[PDB]
Amino acid sequence: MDILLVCLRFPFFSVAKRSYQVRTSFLLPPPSALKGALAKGLILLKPEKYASSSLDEAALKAIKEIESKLVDIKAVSVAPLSPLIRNAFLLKRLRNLESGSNAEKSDAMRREYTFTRELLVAYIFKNLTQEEKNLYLKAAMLIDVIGDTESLATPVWASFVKPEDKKAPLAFSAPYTEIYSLRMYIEKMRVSPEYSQEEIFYLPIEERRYKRIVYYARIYPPEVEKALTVDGEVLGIWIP
Amino acid sequence: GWIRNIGRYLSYLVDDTFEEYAYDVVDGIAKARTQEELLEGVYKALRLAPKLKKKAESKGCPPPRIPSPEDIEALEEKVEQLSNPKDLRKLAVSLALWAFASWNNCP
Amino acid sequence: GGWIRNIGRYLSYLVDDTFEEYAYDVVDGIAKARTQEELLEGVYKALRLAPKLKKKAESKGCPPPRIPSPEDIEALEEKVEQLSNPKDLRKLAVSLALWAFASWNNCP
Amino acid sequence: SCKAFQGQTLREHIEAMLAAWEIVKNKYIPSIIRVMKTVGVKFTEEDADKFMKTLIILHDVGKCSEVYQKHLSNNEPLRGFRHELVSAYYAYNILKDMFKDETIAFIGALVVMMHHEPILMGQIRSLDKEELTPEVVLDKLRTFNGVMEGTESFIKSMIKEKLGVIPKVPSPTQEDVLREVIRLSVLARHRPDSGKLRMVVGALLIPLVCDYKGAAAAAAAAAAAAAAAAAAAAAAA
Amino acid sequence: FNEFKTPQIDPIFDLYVAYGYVVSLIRGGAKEATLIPHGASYLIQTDVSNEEFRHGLVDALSSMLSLHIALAKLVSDADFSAGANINNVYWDSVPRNLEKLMKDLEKKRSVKGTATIPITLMPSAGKYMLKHFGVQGGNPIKVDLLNYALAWVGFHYYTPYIKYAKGDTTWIHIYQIAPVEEVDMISILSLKDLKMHLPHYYESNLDFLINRRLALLYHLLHSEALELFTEKEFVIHSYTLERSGNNQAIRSFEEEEIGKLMDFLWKLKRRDFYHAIKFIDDLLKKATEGALALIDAIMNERLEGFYTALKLGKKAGVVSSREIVAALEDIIC
């Protein structure tokens, strides 16, 4: 298992849940968003391999190839290296995709952008070959945007690493299916993006307050025999 | 902690019974970033003592009392070592904060 | 260094009651000292009234004024000569002039 | 020998209270056993007498815990401290042992907390020239450094000397009293029996507020306050 | 342990239904009931039976409908009929749904239908949902009637709210208090104490009900339920509904906190009460900008805000007594 480690130092998240009026945003980016971003990376890095009549089919085929080299439907995981918050925002979201109401119907709508100082992203692979290891490692970087085109994103470093079978608390995101055996945060994340599925995922986030403010610190969960070390500290992770 | 006594003196500049309404000195003492301007503002506030004395004397109620000389050196024995503006604000703002208290003066 | 209170005791006699000497211009000058020379001029103007108040203090049943000692003058000269910056000079001039307006129990 | 009042000791005050209630039980016991049926507990007239005597023997015990006695030592002001607020903490702990039931102990603690001055909590007009508010009584109770030693055996010498059922006293602390009083207030304010709780608590409180006869009279219009103590003439002769 | 599970749909509506579960249990009994937050699920652990839960729920529905009949297709000026429902159709839809639930449950019959969810119970909902390349007609989101009624019971019984008319337009501020670590039944009931019915203020002097933070400060000023927020950590989720010219939309969804404001109020009112509420009310009525500066200082721990608020208040009509100043100084530390 060649696990791809990257560091995303970007302030605001941009992925919203199934919502209207006020657009509720995910506390952590869902696997669908990261998968789409990596598919975009494959699109603009090697456009000869993925070529479609329309962008939808190119995105679908890039996603399919990524999932082909993925371990299973259980997709990329993340580790919040910074406290999380819900940062409210007001936007002039136009409404013209509905019946009638012409085409210029813009009204102010709220869409909060989750703020994050630092985050880490771990893709779980199944020992992809060397001639494509560089391909996907380069595809890990140049991840310019997440969510919509509003919130920019940037990488810090990219690497491949084994889990070295180390015991450590699970500081990643895992589905609430197998880790049930194990101050809990589980919610619908939509692991698989839709293109014309829904798994409950656990999060290492708690709403503890130290003096006055709450933010969202670490969860300090039970340790897991599978982990990975970055910048010295070791964080546990779940793999199938 | 020698705060009420000076607060009641600063209250003499805001109360309607003294129809002079010295509000600039309150802004000066409240908006103080370092040592010098806070002392300048407190001096400007204290300089109007004869104004208040003759205003209360000529109106009927007992004249206002000047802050005692016993805590005058107490003001400068602490503010000198508040080199950091962050902890200096805790007193600079509080000086004007106590300037708006009730402070019943004349019956 | 303790001489600020001593000089302010004498300065307070220039504006307090029971003295018939309302010298506010000298207090304003000694408190608005922008440079050392005018600060010393204001100090001299304030000290020039020492006989003025001392002679009449005993004429109204009051204790004689606490005229500053020459050691206080030496300390003031030492502080002035070491201050070439108006920054701390402003607060130094404000410090002693603030003692002028105080509830001193000069006459019991 | 701790004294609850300025010049009256606790023992004599409680004796006068129970003596005053002695001539009233025949008038109020039938009226008080009826209202108990609507909350879910039913008991005989003797049990009602025992319950009311338990309330009488323990109605103001916070008056002697290192605070009220010190304030009432020579002249010290009360500073808006509600002693009776801790008394319920005893009652809820004591009555629970007396009747082996939860709701009767809860209502007894609530009613013994109800007298003196009520705590006005939940919505208010923009004026209050009193200390009835909870925001100040909580701060005052934050200074509750337990209770003086003599009280622990005092109740042991109180319930046993009158009737005698079972001696039991808790050990008050700073936090247990807060937890108990907040639980009592919450369970009184938000149990689905909304007005019924108020009605029954007032019905139980009416006999208890007859302490004017027991204590020293200080009201001019006491004739109206003594009309209820009067009863029908026994006979013409 | 019955340990009722709560449907995972929307952490606001999820909170409403899981947070009315407690009152449903209380009205049926169910001693020793607690709420464990699961991020959004908000599970509840208790030892109640399903029939007892149903009895409590029908008791709550009976009380709510009895309150609804007090005012009069029947439209009432209550919390769950027209006070909080900004849409006119819901004014009749909600009572019909509630009485349908009553009829179904009283006959020991589980509900077998689904109904539209209003924006009041969950602002994340609305009229349109982006599927792939557009929206869905009608209202795509639907909820089972049982959870719908439970969330309505919770909203009516627990969550405080404010309605300000000001002529043609209409503002509705809705506040829900969310625990973050753990709560027992007494804590949740203490929070329920905050709810007050018929907050339809209107008038013109009380024009400070705009500026949602100021409105919630004004509402919390006169509330003295329990200083639980100093010993337990709670957050507030609040939102505004506006009907400017029959254009129903939401313009504010900020997520503030309730611990700091309650701590400030308790520290201010611990010294003087007569000079506390009168002070705050006068400052709100006269110095609205000063009140905004004061609440900003409270939420941000800023020294200049208190001075600006006091100066603005003293400019017009505020006495600003000494004891509150001393309390502010003590808070400053």
Ligand code: NI
């Ligand atoms: Ni009594």
Ligand code: NI
């Ligand atoms: Ni008594």
